[PDB]
Every structure is written in C-alpha cells, then in structure tokens.
Amino acid sequence: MDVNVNIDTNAEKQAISPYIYGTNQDFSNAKVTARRIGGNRSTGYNWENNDSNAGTDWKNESDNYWLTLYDVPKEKYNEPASVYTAFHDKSLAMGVPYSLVTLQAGGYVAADQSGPLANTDVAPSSKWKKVEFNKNGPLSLTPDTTDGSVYMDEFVNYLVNKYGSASGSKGIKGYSLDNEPSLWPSTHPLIHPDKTKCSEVLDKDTQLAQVVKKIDPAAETFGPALFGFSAFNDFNSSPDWSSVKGNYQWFIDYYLDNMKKNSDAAGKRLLDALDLHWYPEAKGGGQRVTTSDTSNVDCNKARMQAPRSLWDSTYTEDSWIGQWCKWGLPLIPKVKSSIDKYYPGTKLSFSEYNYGGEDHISGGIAQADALGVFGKYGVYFATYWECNSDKNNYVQSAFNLYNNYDGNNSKYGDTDVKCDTSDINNSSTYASVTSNDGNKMDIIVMNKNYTDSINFNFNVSSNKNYTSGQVWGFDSNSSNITKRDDVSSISGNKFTYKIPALTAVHIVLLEH
Ligand SMILES: [Ca+2]
Numbered sequence: 001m002d003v004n005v006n007i008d009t010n011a012e013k014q015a016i017s018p019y020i021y022g023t024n025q026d027f028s029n030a031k032v033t034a035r036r037i038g039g040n041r042s043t044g045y046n047w048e049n050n051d052s053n054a055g056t057d058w059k060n061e062s063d064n065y066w067l068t069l070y071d072v073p074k075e076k077y078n079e080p081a082s083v084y085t086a087f088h089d090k091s092l093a094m095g096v097p098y099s100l101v102t103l104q105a106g107g108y109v110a111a112d113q114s115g116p117l118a119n120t121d122v123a124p125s126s127k128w129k130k131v132e133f134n135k136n137g138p139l140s141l142t143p144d145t146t147d148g149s150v151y152m153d154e155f156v157n158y159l160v161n162k163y164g165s166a167s168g169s170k171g172i173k174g175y176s177l178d179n180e181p182s183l184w185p186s187t188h189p190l191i192h193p194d195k196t197k198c199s200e201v202l203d204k205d206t207q208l209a210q211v212v213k214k215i216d217p218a219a220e221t222f223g224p225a226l227f228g229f230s231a232f233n234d235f236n237s238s239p240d241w242s243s244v245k246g247n248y249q250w251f252i253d254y255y256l257d258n259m260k261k262n263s264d265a266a267g268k269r270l271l272d273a274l275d276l277h278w279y280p281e282a283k284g285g286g287q288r289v290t291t292s293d294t295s296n297v298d299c300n301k302a303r304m305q306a307p308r309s310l311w312d313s314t315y316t317e318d319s320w321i322g323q324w325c326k327w328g329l330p331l332i333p334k335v336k337s338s339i340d341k342y343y344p345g346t347k348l349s350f351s352e353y354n355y356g357g358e359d360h361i362s363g364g365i366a367q368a369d370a371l372g373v374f375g376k377y378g379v380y381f382a383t384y385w386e387c388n389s390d391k392n393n394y395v396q397s398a399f400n401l402y403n404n405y406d407g408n409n410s411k412y413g414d415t416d417v418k419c420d421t422s423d424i425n426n427s428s429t430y431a432s433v434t435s436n437d438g439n440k441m442d443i444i445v446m447n448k449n450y451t452d453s454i455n456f457n458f459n460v461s462s463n464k465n466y467t468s469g470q471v472w473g474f475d476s477n478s479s480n481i482t483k484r485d486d487v488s489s490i491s492g493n494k495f496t497y498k499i500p501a502l503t504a505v506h507i508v509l510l511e512h
C-alpha cells in the first residue's frame, strides 16, 4: 500500500523530555535514560534495615527481597538505604541522568525478615515499624533500628547527604509518594486494611511532598502513582469519593485542584509530576494485550494499536474503559486538559506501563510506538515495568531503536516536529530535530500491518536540504537492529522508502 508522510520541521515543534526512555528493570542490552525504584515492594520498605514485605503478590512475606534484587553486598545488608544507594550508584555508573526513588506513606514498614505473615500480624504489631513523615528531633545518618518508628525526612536527608541535591550532577532527581495508594488494602492488607480515602491520599501526598521539598527544594515529586483507570476515575470506588466529587469529572481533577490549592497554601509547588500507571486494558482475540501469549494474532494486532488510546480520538479500543468511560480517552489529551484546568505547569509521568508480548515483533512495535507517543505528546518521565521474566528482546530493540540504533549510542532528536502519516492504522511516524545539530533529522517509521508492505512517500518541508538517508531497523525475523539499505535518492527533500510488514525503522537524514 502507499502511505504519504508529511514532515514540517518548522511546525508543531515540541521539546522531547529526555527521561521518557526509562525503566524499572535493567536491560541486558538496551539504552535507558531514567530508572525507578518503586512498585508494590516500596510501600513497606524499611530504609533503616532494608526489610520489605511482598504484600499479597507473595504471601505477605517479610524478607530480604530488595537486598537481593538490587545486588547489595552482604556487608551492607544493615547499612541504611543500602538498597537505594546500590540503585542510585548504578544509575550514576550507567550515565543515567534521572533516578526516581520511592518514599513510604502506606503507614508501616517491615520490622523483620520473618517470612510469610499471618492475618493476625496486621499493623500495628511487632512485625511493623510506624512511618512518620517528620522526626521533629535532629536527623542522623545512623538511624535507630531499635525503636518503633521510621522517619521519611531522615531517609531523604541520608540520600542528599550522600549524593547532594537534585540540582547537582549526582543528586537523585525524583521522589515517588509511595505507590498505588487506592490498592493499599488489597496489595497491603496487613499495612493498610481499610479503603484509602480521597482525603487520606491528598493529605499523605501533601505532607510527604512537603518533606521532600524541605530536605531537597530542587527535587521533584511524583504522585499519586495511581494503578490504572479505575483509580483515575473514582479512586477505585473510594468510600469518600461521592462526598468530595462535587463537579469534578474524575479523581484526577480533585487531586490536581487540591494539590494546587495545597501548593498555593504552602507557598511552593508540592506536585511536580502527576504520576500514573498504565497497563492497557485493550483486548484482541478475547485477550488483554498485556498477555505473554503471542500465538493470538488478533491480540497481537490490538497490541500495536493499543498505544493509540493514549492520543487518538478516532480510535476505539476493546475494553471496559473503551465501553464505559469514553469520556476519559484518549488518555493523554484528557489528562492534559485536567492539568491545564486544575494545576497548569504540572508534568505527566508514566512510572509503570507494559504492552505485553515483549519477546515478539508486536511487543517491540507497541513499545516503539509508546516511546514515540510519550515524546510527541509532552510526557516528562516514563519507566517500563517488566512482566515476562526478562524475555524482553523486542522491548529492548524498541529502546535501542531510539538511542542506540547503530550500537554507537547515536540517538533520536530532542525536538519532535510535525510528522503526519496518511494511515494511522497501518503506520506510526515520528520525526525529530536536534536543537544543537541542524545537519540531521531522525524519523521513526513502523509498519503495523501483519502481512502487507508499505511504500512510504515522504515529503519533508524544511529550510534544510537533506541529501542522504541511512536506515536501521528490526522486524519479525530478528530483534537485532540491523543497518538497512540507504535511502535511494533524495530530491528536493522528497524520497520514498518501502518497509515490509511488521518492521520498525529509524531513518537518519543528513544535509552532508
Ligand atoms: Ca527507627
């Protein structure tokens, strides 16, 4: 089929945030620009001794899981925050410019490593230390592990003491206000048996964000870290939602408006990034696309289309969101409208997401598309979450397609520009320019079609004169990014490139 692509390097310009190419889990061979330590294990992580609790993901088990996961040596097992310092040390060693780390708000953190806890061990008990936000006495780099409490200000202070402020080269840049708070009772029944109130989340986010700003005025806060659309909507059927709803379309408006009001009252921004998790509910072939089963072709197809629910008002996905909450899709324009109406200047983060089929071309194309979307639509931060025991070779290809396509860490541009394809069903196209190198334009082009090749007819409107194009890509035959044939000929900033089915490509155009 033929598809036209119209690029204008002087229209619809948008700064691409460098921190969209992040992860929660390290890749064996993929370039990242941001890393998070967060998720379910964060809520009951004790910084004083590194103990944590799995909650209902793993038998309410209190253990050394985070010590092993983050490769803390045995002689640092009892060093405060050794899990977080191993983590941020690795960020620095890798040259990764942004670490997002999680602080605790659930209410209690593991006191020991006694294994699976009984329902009788519900907090408060000898199994739990109480979280407090403020110590109200002098801070120590050697916190007391023998009392019944753990202090968040003392924790951040330890980290800043080691690394300095976020304003400097080594500082941790971001702090997450715990994790998935409306799921505290079902993920962490032993910490937080009761449903989380809208007023409770607001208050805890507000007070925890004030601790961060006190200790590191330059550090950024991420909240509320909502699990999914149900929490965006009515904070997962929060018992107090009816009484605080008023005119608010959804909990996101309530949350933004009140953080704005709370920030104005405190005299400083307390929320830097509205932080959200997005595991697509989109289905194909009767399956949610997050599945690892790639034998299901209609599921594979839905997977590559699913990123369209983030931005495209013409796309309808097969899900309960698509059926019952059409008002909330496409997601990013909706959230962006809420930000512009309730808390202007707030950034948007996706600290967990995963499109499934990680070891399949449909999983790589969907991941490549999600990364394009984040960059085109003003996402500040995003961190992929691993769902398939590191069987993620095509996910890694997508990351490398952007920032290490040639194995020499050549990267995508920092400025998104107008790049309109005539077929959004069968293709995705992103173009970028690099603010300090006018010699080049970078284009991501994917053929989402399962069987047919696409002749892409490119029309670049620019004052630059591009004369050569190089091409790198992956496809259904290999996750390995191979250098493909050069662009044939460029005449008057126009050229053609034929892409086979299920292929994702990075095109580099040069004036010279
Ligand atoms: Ca203590």
Ligand SMILES: [Cl-]
Residues within 6 Å of the ligand: 179, 180, 181, 182, 183, 225, 226, 227, 228, 231
């Ligand atoms: Cl949540």
